């Protein structure tokens with residue numbers, strides 16, 4: 001298989017991670033998706049200790065606890081699995097950690113979770129943090145740099161990606177350290193559109209295209225995949241892969257990215 005890196009986000013609240021492994025290319029048998037993203041664990045805030053911390057809702061916890069059936073099989077077949085981390089309406093977000101030490105403690109929780117569950121990486125989605133709730137501060141310009149630097153240091157050989165949205169995504173440089181190069185990938189969060197991420201990464205690691213499989217018209221899915229290849233971009237994002245038969249939708253972009261339509265087990 002040769003072509004852009006395919007990524008699929010799965011809202012584990014309602015869907016199975018395994019669905020991502022169901023699609024392969026008719027010509028070649030390669031995976032239609034190269035990366036699967038568990039959406040989403042989150043950044044919580046303890047008002048008492050005034051400390052942010054990593055939280056997994058029951059659904060996220062359930063899939064992590066069942067890594068052998070929910071995650072391991074995807075990895076066995078060559079698909080990378082990442083844990084997305086999202087804001088949780090509690091004031092704490094990736095852009096408002098008060099210090100280097102504070103950001104670093106949270107990065108350890110992340111890297112520890114990655115090792116414990118045998119994950120391939122982390123995805124940062126700075127949305128719904130609601131900076132300010134519970135007496136918290138507004139995003140500052142060192143928090144994210146500190147968090148990314150620590151995480152990357154913690155897991156040098158794993159994946160770290162950026163869902164391109166929010167205060168954090170605009171605060172990649174501080175004190176002479178630009179954290180753009182510590183990210184493996186970055187992508188557009190707006191389904192049905194082409195929006196090149198601002199983060200200073202080369203085309204090969206960016207996905208200006210974004211589609212919500214089953215919702216975006218197969219014409220637009222095909223168009224964005226076509227533009228991806230034509231403009232030389234190296235990633236393509238599919239959001240909300242569900243349990244329905246989306247072979248036609250997956251084929252809409254695989255024909256363009258890989259030259260083969262897809263098959264679903």
Ligand SMILES: [Zn+2]
Pocket residue numbers: 089130
């Ligand atoms: Zn809210």
